[PDB]
C-alpha cells in the first residue's frame, strides 16, 4: 500500500524555523507529483506547496510564499518543507499528499489520493508545561433523574495534545472529552466529563487518566463525590 509519513514537527517560537520531512513507501516516488497541505485547529484544509517529480515545477500559496521552501530527494524517496519566519497562525497539522494525475475519457484531472497522518507544528512563546488536573465533583448542582455528572479539568498545559480516559479505559459510555481551548496565557485547557448512574457514586470510584507526552506528565485523579 501507499504510505506517507511526516516528521519534523514540534515546537518553535515566532520568527523561528523548522524543517519537515516526508518519506514515501509502497510506490515509485520519483514518478509522482507531491503536495504539502496543512489544517489549523478548527479550520479547513489549506494547500501550501506543490512540486513536480523532477522539481522543475513548484507552486506556493500566497500565505506561505517567501517563507516556506519545498524540495525533494527522489533517491531517498523523501520530500521536505523548510519553514522560516513562522507565525502563530502557522500552528497546524502538516500533511504530505501524493498527487496522482489520471488522463481519462472525460479529461485530465488531479487526485490527492494519499494523505499521511500528519505532524503537529506549534508556534508560540510558551514553554512546555504539564497540566493541572482538577476534579469536577458530583454534587447537588449535578441534577439528573438517577444519573450524575462528573468530570476532570485539564488546565494550563502546553502544547497539544493530551489523552484522557476514565478508569483506565473501563468507563467509555457517556464520556465527553471537549476540544481544548487556547487561553490568553498561551496555555491550553480542556474538560472531560461523563454521566454515570447517580446510584453508583458511593459504589464505584471514578478516576480520570491524563497523559501529556510533551511534558512527560501522567496524572491519575479520582473524582470524589460531594455529599451536599
Amino acid at each position: 500500500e501507499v504510505q506517507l509519513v511526516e516528521s519534523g514537527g514540534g515546537l518553535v517560537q515566532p520568527g523561528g524555523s523548522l524543517r519537515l520531512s516526508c518519506v514515501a513507501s509502497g510506490f515509485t516516488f520519483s514518478n509522482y507529483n507531491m503536495n504539502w497541505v496543512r489544517q489549523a485547529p478548527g479550520k479547513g484544509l489549506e494547500w501550501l506547496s506543490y512540486i513536480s517529480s523532477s522539481s522543475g515545477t513548484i507552486y506556493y500559496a500566497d500565505s506561505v510564499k517567501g517563507r516556506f521552501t519545498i524540495s525533494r530527494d527522489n533517491a531517498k524517496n523523501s520530500m521536505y518543507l523548510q519553514m522560516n519566519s513562522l507565525r502563530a497562525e502557522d500552528t497546524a497539522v502538516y500533511y504530505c499528499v501524493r498527487v496522482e494525475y489520471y488522463y481519462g475519457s472525460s479529461g485530465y484531472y488531479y487526485d490527492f489520493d494519499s494523505w499521511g497522518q500528519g505532524t503537529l507544528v506549534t508556534v508560540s512563546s510558551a514553554s512546555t508545561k504539564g497540566p493541572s488536573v482538577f476534579p469536577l465533583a458530583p454534587s447537588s448542582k449535578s441534577t439528573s433523574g438517577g444519573t450524575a455528572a462528573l468530570g476532570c479539568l485539564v488546565k494550563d498545559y502546553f502544547p497539544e495534545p493530551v489523552t484522557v480516559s476514565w478508569n483506565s479505559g473501563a468507563l467509555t459510555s457517556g464520556v465527553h472529552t471537549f476540544p481544548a481551548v487556547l487561553q490568553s496565557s498561551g496555555l491550553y485547557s480542556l474538560s472531560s466529563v461523563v454521566t454515570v448512574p447517580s446510584s453508583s457514586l458511593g459504589t464505584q470510584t471514578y478516576i480520570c487518566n491524563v497523559n501529556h507526552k510533551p511534558s512527560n506528565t501522567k496524572v491519575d485523579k479520582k473524582v470524589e463525590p460531594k455529599s451536599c
Binding site: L45, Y110, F112, S227
Partner: protein, 217 residues
C-alpha cells in the same frame, strides 16, 4: 490567490432527503470548455477523497447520488439521496491556479430538537489553593448546535472572561455537547456571591438557569 467561498458552513440534512452545497470563485474557472473545480470529502477520522473533478465528473467508485454542476464562478455539489455515511466536511478546490480549497461545508445529521441537560461545577479546593477559580457550565446532549451561554455573577453580565467548546456530532445519538469555563482570580471569586450560567436554546421553553452559591459543598 484565487478566493473560494462555500455556503453554508454547517448543513443539517435528514437521511434520505436531498442536499446541495454552493461554492463561489473570485474569478472564472472556465477555460476551453473545462471548469477547473474539484469537490473533496473528508469523513470523520479519514483522509480526504476525490468526489468530483472538472466540475461535473464523478471520480471512480463515487455513487450516483453525488453530482456536480455550475460554470464560471458559481458551482453546486448536489446529493440526491443523503446516506448516513456521507457525513463529513465537503471542500471545493480550484485547480486553475493550483491550488485553493474552500472553507468547507460540514454535512451533519438532522434530527429532532433536543433539550440540553445543564450542570455546573464549582471550583475545586485544589485549584483555589493555587490562586485561580474555574466554574464549568455543561450543556449535555442537545440539538441543534446553536446555544447561548451567558455568565451572570450577582446578576451582572460577564464578558471576555469565559471560553466555549463544543464536541463533534455524536456517532450514535447525533447530538452535541457544550462546555463553558468561567475563569476568575481567587480574590475576584471571594468578592462575589451568586454564580450562574443562563442557557438559551430552542429545545427549552424559556432560558433555563442553573446556579450555585459560593461556599456550599
Amino acid at each position: 490567490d484565487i478566493v473560494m467561498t462555500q455556503s453554508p458552513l454547517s448543513l443539517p440534512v435528514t437521511p434520505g432527503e436531498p442536499a446541495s452545497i454552493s461554492c463561489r470563485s473570485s474569478q472564472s474557472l472556465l477555460h476551453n470548455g473545462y471548469n477547473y473545480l474539484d469537490w473533496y470529502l473528508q469523513k470523520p477520522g479519514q483522509s480526504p477523497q476525490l468526489l468530483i473533478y472538472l466540475g461535473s465528473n464523478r471520480a471512480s467508485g463515487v455513487p450516483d447520488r453525488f453530482s456536480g454542476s455550475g460554470s464560471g464562478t458559481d458551482f453546486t455539489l448536489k446529493i440526491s439521496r443523503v446516506e448516513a455515511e456521507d457525513v463529513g466536511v465537503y471542500y471545493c478546490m480550484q485547480t486553475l491556479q493550483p491550488f485553493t480549497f474552500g472553507q468547507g461545508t460540514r454535512l451533519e445529521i438532522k434530527r429532532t430538537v433536543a433539550a440540553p441537560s445543564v450542570f455546573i461545577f464549582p471550583p475545586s479546593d485544589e485549584q483555589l489553593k493555587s490562586g485561580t477559580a474555574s466554574v464549568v457550565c455543561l450543556l449535555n446532549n442537545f440539538y441543534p448546535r446553536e446555544a447561548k451561554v451567558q455568565w451572570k455573577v450577582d446578576n451582572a453580565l460577564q464578558s471576555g472572561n469565559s471560553q466555549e467548546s463544543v464536541t463533534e456530532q455524536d456517532s450514535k445519538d447525533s447530538t452535541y455537547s457544550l462546555s463553558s469555563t468561567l475563569t476568575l482570580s481567587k480574590a475576584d471569586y471571594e468578592k462575589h456571591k451568586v454564580y450562574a450560567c443562563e442557557v438559551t436554546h430552542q429545545g427549552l421553553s424559556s432560558p433555563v438557569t442553573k446556579s450555585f452559591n459560593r461556599g456550599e459543598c
